[PDB]
Design a binder for this molecule. Structure first.
Ligand code: K
Ligand code: K
Ligand code: K
Ligand code: MG
Ligand code: MG
Ligand code: MG
Ligand code: MG
Ligand code: MG
Ligand code: MG
Ligand code: MG
Ligand code: MG
Ligand code: MG
Ligand code: MG
Ligand code: MG
Ligand code: MG
Ligand code: MG
Ligand code: MG
Ligand code: MG
Ligand code: MG
Ligand code: MG
Ligand code: MG
Ligand code: MG
Ligand code: MG
Ligand code: MG
Ligand code: MG
Ligand code: ZN
Lengths: 24, 80, 127, 206, 60, 125, 155, 98
RNA sequence: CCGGGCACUCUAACGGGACUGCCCGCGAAAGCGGGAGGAAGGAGGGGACGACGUCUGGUCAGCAUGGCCCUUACGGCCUGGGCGACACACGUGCUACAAUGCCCACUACAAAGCGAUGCCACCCGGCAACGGGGAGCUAAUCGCAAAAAGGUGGGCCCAGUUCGGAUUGGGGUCUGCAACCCGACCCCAUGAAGCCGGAAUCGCUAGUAAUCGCGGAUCAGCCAUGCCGCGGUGAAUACG
């Protein structure tokens, strides 16, 4: 969930981007 | 998960005091207030007394510890 | 030739243009069902027409902006209801009782200070 | 502790600002720090003139300004010898080169800031508080005003136990956002310590 | 405000980091609003006096 | 089949199944099925001996896994520990190592709460 | 509610069966204001009932509700030191509130993985006269009268 | 094509600078595009009322920056005069990107 | 997108608008109960605003201030520590224990805000953090910007498990003179407790609760899960 750093919703919550949530 | 980037940091207080002290060879003791500085190759063999805020702890530097900051051998707090 | 209302809800603006025709409904250049894809509520948006036997005697071009889809659905609900009266003011005699003419005033209440969410107060202990 | 400053509360209507100069997120803090430096000096000296207000307008290095006093002369000086030194004291403070008009306070007993200053002085000279208050309310109430009130803090009369003397007449509706009530606060150092003085004058409603 | 630690105006921090806002009016160092240079307390004091132009009491 | 040291992922998608290996996670899993071209969705029970070989081949020679990994990691900790190193001491004292508050919740590294007598009057709240 | 008498708020009829009673059940099913998801669940249920049953789901829904309504219940009241379970009638309004609430609660106690199946099967076992819902209804009524000795404390 | 930008803190101080520029130009230039509103930019300052603790009080303050546009087409020389030195507002700032 | 037009939507100034006025019923009156028009009734909904006073309440560490005390140190400058300690106890919260769910795709619909020594479109390199390079913006023109929940599709099948992400090993990117004590952020490993919580106890009456995400102040960076705001979806129940 929101606490999973390396996941979709995880990056959102932590307000970041990366492999699991790229900037499109 | 350590980090610093490209440009290993080391205060030049002891640096120009060590690499320079390597001219005659080695020496007994040193006294620094730079926990900040990284331990580099040219220190192995030296005995750098580090300050922990109250004391100047004598830290013998070895090969296996090249890379760690000096503060890591001068523990700040005192528990039991 | 063409009739038009408006309708707004919870901060959703709806531009409703009714023109005689089949029963096609365009919402932002999209089939009604295209925009409100799988939203059980949607059906509602056109309730006013059915409230007077229109729908199968009209066609509608709809614009929308601001808010969320269900809010937009409520706005559209009013536009269609308004224009449907500009068309024939005798239609109020039926849409009134169903309150289709009313603009729901309910809006997100302001977030007060010292209070997690406007009303939800902080939990306290050892009192 | 309750009740907002009746001025900060009435800025919307019945009560304009004391600095009508616009600015942007880069200079505002400066033009502000400036006004204060201004009021800092103006008050540090013109005390004797009895300065009720001090507006400050701007447009671009042409810092309008003004100073509403009860006794203009004190500002001016022999022909204008004081209003000179000071006028240069402004541009020496801030190389802005600005005006320095002077409005006269028709009645110094309808300007809360003065009425406060008034009583505040008496307190230091050791006048009986209750009297001063009673009186002050009168001066204000006699020369017009649909209402008025005065409040002194504590250690009244050098007492160890801080108190709070009252006194007020007519109307002073603070909850009514339209009262147009001048508020004035005057400190009051003393051998034994500070005493705060607030003054309220209700003049005209709508 | 310990009129000695009001050496913030120093501008010679050796390293731009050590630079810290600090109130211009109180010396208050813990709630200094960039925009006003004031602390939350004085920012509230002057605003009441109408001495902060434009600054009104918000309500909605 | 057994890929890494006696590993037996089975009856479940190979990618998921590969996870049951010490050293492999969603990433290295998906990656190996990639560089070995095997549909991840296939149940290992439906894998091919041909495939099971390429997998076994790749994975085993390309990464330090299972026991060999624990050995290394074991080693590491013991190193910063054999050295004066602050980080080492923390490991010895069994306390957090990544600079965390030990005044409260530090349970995961400490274990169960070994409660002791306290000072009643003085709302410890 | 110390002043007025908080009047019951009316709900918007069903977007399908045009039934208020249905929106209600949907509201109970709904969690975290996800009224869409709520709606779908209920409907797939009316569908699953169409399947295993050659009867209109709306009629099954009703029947079910009816069987889970408690016409009597016990209410606690302190009198003379101790508290006594006083049985008393149950207003129509509360019966409905209770019936629907229990259906969803009982349904979510069920073993089927899919939400829709649960409401469906619970709704059926309900109109049949069985199911966890109807039990609650019965365990309640059994509770009442089982204390008829105190029925004179009308309340 | 005269671009006129009016900003301020008072919405009368600006409307009193969009009037001293709306008629004093309709006698030398285009029929002019009336003063155009333009959304405001509000800046909120939320402060804890008291000096010590009591973090649940707080009062709300704000700086509302109103805007105006105007935009008079056809400089016409004669317009650039009726609007040369004929204003009044002190709590205003003007901009021209014609 | 261009011509072109202010209709519409907005933007934002100024006005209109609701008065128990109108109708029936009760009443001495005030007013109560309905009914009609109306976007809106009978305080429309939410703020700002909190009397004489009480707690001898908070705050001399925001400031101001009487007295008292130190005035080569109870002042001052640095470097390094500390405020981050950890057997243990409590408060407020965060993330969870999962299928009305979690993933990955792909597609929608916000509102208020912020943006020179800055937002940073777009392009290239890098799994990525981020680094090169650069368009436009002193912003209703450009940018932060994707809103998320939803919707379509597909995977997982009920397991401490595609639930949950705590710890810990490793490799890095940034901000900064400098990240040991003591920074966020990325990637690979690791994958803890937790299967819904004893006695107790908290919030909330509707766009409220619950739930979803977005922006701000402070600020280099950040330990924001705090705080102050914004909008999406949107209940239950109140006998008494
Ligand atoms: K109102
Ligand atoms: K006291
Ligand atoms: K959640
Ligand atoms: Mg997960
Ligand atoms: Mg729907
Ligand atoms: Mg909300
Ligand atoms: Mg001081
Ligand atoms: Mg700083
Ligand atoms: Mg500042
Ligand atoms: Mg694994
Ligand atoms: Mg610690
Ligand atoms: Mg009032
Ligand atoms: Mg106390
Ligand atoms: Mg006390
Ligand atoms: Mg602390
Ligand atoms: Mg807790
Ligand atoms: Mg790339
Ligand atoms: Mg377990
Ligand atoms: Mg897992
Ligand atoms: Mg650090
Ligand atoms: Mg389970
Ligand atoms: Mg925020
Ligand atoms: Mg920040
Ligand atoms: Mg930390
Ligand atoms: Mg944060
Ligand atoms: Zn201050």
């Amino acid at each position: 969930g929101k606490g999973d750093r390396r996941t979709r919703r995880g990056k959102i919550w932590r307000g970041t981007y990366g492999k699991y949530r790229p900037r499109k | 998960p350590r980090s610093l980037k490209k440009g290993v940091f080391v205060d030049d207080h002891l640096l120009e005091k060590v690499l320079e002290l390597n001219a005659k060879g080695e020496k007994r003791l040193i006294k620094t207030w730079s926990r900040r500085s990284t331990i580099v190759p040219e220190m192995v063999g030296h005995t750098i007394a580090v300050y922990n805020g109250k004391q100047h702890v004598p830290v013998y530097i070895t090969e296996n510890m090249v890379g760690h900051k000096l503060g890591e051998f001068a523990p700040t707090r005192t528990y039991r | 030739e063409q009739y038009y209302g408006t309708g707004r809800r919870k901060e959703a603006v709806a531009r409703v243009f009714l023109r005689p025709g089949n029963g096609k409904v365009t919402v932002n250049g999209q089939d009604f069902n295209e925009y409100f894809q799988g939203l059980v509520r949607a059906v509602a948006a056109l309730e006013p027409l059915r409230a007077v036997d229109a729908l199968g005697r009209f066609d509608a071009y709809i614009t929308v902006r601001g808010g969320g889809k269900s809010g937009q659905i409520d706005a559209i609900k009013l536009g269609i209801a308004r224009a449907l009266v500009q068309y024939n003011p005798d239609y109020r005699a039926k849409l009134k009782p169903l309150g289709f003419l009313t603009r729901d005033a309910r809006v997100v209440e302001r977030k007060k200070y010292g209070k997690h969410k406007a009303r939800r107060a902080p939990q306290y202990s050892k009192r | 502790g309750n009740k907002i400053h009746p001025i900060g509360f009435r800025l919307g209507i019945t009560r304009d600002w004391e600095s009508r100069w616009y600015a942007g997120k880069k200079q505002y803090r400066h033009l502000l720090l400036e006004d204060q430096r201004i009021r800092g000096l103006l008050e540090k000296e013109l005390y004797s003139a009895g300065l009720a207000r001090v507006d400050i307008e701007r447009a671009a290095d042409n810092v309008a300004v003004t100073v509403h006093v009860a006794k203009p002369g004190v500002v001016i000086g022999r022909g204008g010898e004081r209003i000179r030194v000071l006028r240069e004291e402004l541009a020496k403070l801030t190389g802005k080169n600005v005006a320095l008009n002077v409005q006269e306070v028709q009645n110094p007993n309808l300007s809360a800031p003065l009425v406060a200053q008034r009583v505040a002085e008496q307190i230091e000279r050791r006048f009986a508080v209750r009297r001063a208050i009673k009186q002050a309310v009168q001066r204000v109430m006699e020369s017009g005003a649909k209402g008025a009130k005065v409040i002194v803090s504590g250690r009244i009369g050098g007492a160890e136990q801080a108190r709070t003397e009252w006194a007020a007449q007519g109307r002073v509706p603070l909850h009514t956002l339209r009262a147009n009530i001048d508020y004035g606060f005057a400190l009051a150092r003393t051998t034994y310590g500070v005493l705060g003085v607030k003054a309220y004058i209700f003049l005209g409603e709508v | 405000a310990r009129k000695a630690l009001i050496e913030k105006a120093k501008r010679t921090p050796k390293f731009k980091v050590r630079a810290y806002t600090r109130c211009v009016r109180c010396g208050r160092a813990r709630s200094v609003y960039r925009f006003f240079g004031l602390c939350r307390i004085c920012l509230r004091e002057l605003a009441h006096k109408g001495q902060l132009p434009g600054v009104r009491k918000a309500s909605w | 089949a057994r890929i890494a040291g006696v590993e037996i992922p089975r009856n479940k998608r190979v990618d998921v199944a590969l996870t049951y290996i010490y050293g492999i996670g969603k990433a290295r899993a998906k990656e190996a099925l990639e560089k070995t071209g095997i549909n991840p969705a296939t149940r290992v029970k439906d894998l091919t001996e041909a495939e099971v070989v390429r997998l076994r081949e790749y994975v085993e020679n390309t990464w330090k896994l299972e026991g060999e990994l624990r050995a290394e990691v074991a080693a590491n900790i013991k190193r910063l520990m054999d050295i004066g190193c602050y980080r080492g001491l923390r490991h010895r004292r069994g306390l957090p190592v990544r600079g965390q508050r030990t005044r409260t919740n530090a349970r995961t590294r400490k274990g169960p709460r070994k409660t002791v007598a306290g000072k009643k009057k003085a709302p410890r709240k | 509610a110390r002043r007025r008498r908080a009047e019951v708020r009316q709900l918007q009829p069903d977007l399908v069966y045009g039934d208020v009673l249905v929106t209600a059940f949907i509201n109970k099913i709904m969690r975290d204001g996800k009224k869409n998801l709520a709606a779908r669940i209920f409907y797939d249920a009316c569908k699953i009932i169409q399947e295993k049953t050659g009867q209109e789901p709306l009629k099954v829904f009703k029947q079910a509700v009816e069987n889970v309504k408690p016409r009597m219940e016990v209410r606690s009241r302190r009198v003379g030191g101790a508290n006594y379970q006083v049985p008393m009638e149950v207003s129509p309004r509360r019966q409905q509130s209770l019936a629907l609430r229990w259906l969803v609660q009982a349904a979510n106690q069920r073993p089927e993985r899919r939400a829709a199946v649960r409401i469906a099967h619970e709704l059926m076992d309900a109109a049949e006269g069985k199911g966890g819902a109807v039990k609650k209804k019965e365990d309640v009524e059994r509770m009442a009268e089982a204390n008829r000795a105190y029925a004179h404390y009308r309340w | 094509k005269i671009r006129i930008k009016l900003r301020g803190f008072d919405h009368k101080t600006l409307d009193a600078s969009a009037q001293k520029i709306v008629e004093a130009a309709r006698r030398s230039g285009a029929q002019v595009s009336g003063p155009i509103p333009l959304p405001t930019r509000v800046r909120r300052f939320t402060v804890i009322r008291g000096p010590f603790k009591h973090k649940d009080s707080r009062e709300h303050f704000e700086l509302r920056t109103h805007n105006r546009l105007v935009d008079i087409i056809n400089p016409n020389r004669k317009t650039i005069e009726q609007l040369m030195t004929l204003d009044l507002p002190t709590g205003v700032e003007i901009e021209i990107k014609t």
